[PDB]
Amino acid sequence: KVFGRCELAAAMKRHGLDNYRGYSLGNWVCAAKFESNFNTQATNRNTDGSTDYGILQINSRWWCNDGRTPGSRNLCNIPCSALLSSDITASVNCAKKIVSDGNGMNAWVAWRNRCKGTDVQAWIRGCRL
Numbered sequence: 001k002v003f004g005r006c007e008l009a010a011a012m013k014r015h016g017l018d019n020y021r022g023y024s025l026g027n028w029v030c031a032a033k034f035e036s037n038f039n040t041q042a043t044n045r046n047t048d049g050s051t052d053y054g055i056l057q058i059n060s061r062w063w064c065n066d067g068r069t070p071g072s073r074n075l076c077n078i079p080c081s082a083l084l085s086s087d088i089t090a091s092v093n094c095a096k097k098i099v100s101d102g103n104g105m106n107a108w109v110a111w112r113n114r115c116k117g118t119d120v121q122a123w124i125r126g127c128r129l
């Protein structure tokens with residue numbers, strides 16, 4: 001599913017991402033734009049043989065099992081295909097676990113380099129949430 005910006009913001013709010021671990025909603029919308037262009041079916045393969053899955057591009061080495069990644073730990077205890085559904089529940093629950101893992105949202109390089117420190121609440125303006 002390709003979300004619209006405001007549609008995704010509304011969904012992420014419903015799933016309790018607003019100020020989760022202190023990160024206002026715009027952070028999560030910004031991250032999804034630069035990670036996946038709002039596409040839940042996005043996949044990208046990395047050099048270490050892992051793959052990133054879904055709207056927040058969660059990686060298969062540590063977080064989900066995709067049946068082909070060496071060193072797989074499956075910390076969210078999900079198959080990575082669950083991260084591609086039009087229902088973002090699985091991506092949200094796994095992201096909540098990732099952001100609580102010690103580094104906050106710095107785990108997402110695209111968020112670190114293109115979102116962190118910017119006017120992230122601009123990502124939810126015009127969406128009457």
Ligand SMILES: Cc1c(C)c2c3c4c1OP(=O)(O)Oc1c(C)c(C)c5c(c1C4)Cc1c(c(c(C)c(C)c1OP(=O)(O)O5)OP(=O)(O)O2)C3
Nearest residue numbers: 048060061062063064065068069070071072073074075076
């Ligand atoms: C904190 C921690 C936990 C909770 C572990 C393990 C390790 C671990 O310490 P860590 O500092 O990561 O050191 C390791 C490093 C750097 C590598 C490269 C390892 C392993 C470990 C050891 C072995 C290992 C372990 C696993 C699982 C599922 C795999 C696949 C696995 O092989 P793999 O990832 O290729 O090789 O079991 P599990 O995650 O339950 O337990 C064992």
